[PDB]
Amino acid sequence: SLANQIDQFLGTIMQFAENKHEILLGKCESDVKLTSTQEHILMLLAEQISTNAKIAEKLKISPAAVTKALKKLQEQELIKSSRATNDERVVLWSLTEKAVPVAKEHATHHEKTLSTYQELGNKFTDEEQEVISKFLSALTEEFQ
């Protein structure tokens, strides 16, 4: 039955998701060994220099966790801190040269993940795609 496939499919999503913090397909191809969360922060910092707080929000984790992750990245020479223009208590984090290709690769990993969903969707007709879109909206509601 459909309910059974839905159930199994979700289970499959989790066996895949242990232990990552996010779903990316294919292999990270970055030469620097870091966690998805670490690389992700680097990617966020490339799109926009940021505070501990803005990051906590984007990633949806404790500031305390962010602080831990940033200190590690700072020690690994992947990020550097600086003060804000007007307010000097505001601490801003940005990429170093070392991190630029790493941010770049992770963004790409995101792009390839999206491309895959996209090519999967495109094996369906325009109208097929619209049924699948309503299924996902419906299913998305149960988990809110």
Q: Which residues are annotated as a binding site for Zn(2+)?
A: 22, 28, 39-40, 105-106, 109-110
Binding of residue 55 to Zn ion (CB under 5 A): no
Q: Please choose which of Zn ion, its own copies, none residue 28 contacts, taking the beta carbon within 5 to 8 angstroms, the exact cut-off set by kind.
A: Zn ion
Least distance to its own copies, CB of residue 109, Å: 12
Does 23 interact with its own copies (rule: CB under 8 A)? Answer: yes
The one-letter amino acid code at 144 reads Q
Among 28, 49, 56, 59, indicate the residue that binds Zn ion (CB under 5 A).
28
> Is 27 an interacting residue with respect to its own copies (CB under 8 A)?
no
Cβ-count burial of 136 within 10 angstroms (0-12 exposed, 13-18 middle, 19+ buried)?
exposed
Q: Assess 123 for contact with its own copies (CB under 8 A).
A: yes
Give the shortest CB-144-to-its own copies separation in angstroms: 7
Candidate list 65, 84, 100, 131; residue touching its own copies; CB under 8 A: 131
Task: Kindly state whether residue 40 participates in binding Zn ion, applying the rule CB under 5 A.
Answer: yes
Residue 2 interacts with which of its own copies, Zn ion, none, CB < 5 to 8 Å by class:
its own copies
List 17, 64, 84, 100, residue binding its own copies (CB under 8 A):
17
Give the chain as a DSSP string.
-HHHHHHHHHHHHHHHHSS-SS---S----SS---HHHHHHHHHHHHS-B-HHHHHHHHT--HHHHHHHHHHHHHTTSEEEEE-SS-TT-EEEEE-GGGHHHHHHHHHHHHHHHHHHHHHHTTS-HHHHHHHHHHHHHHHHHT-
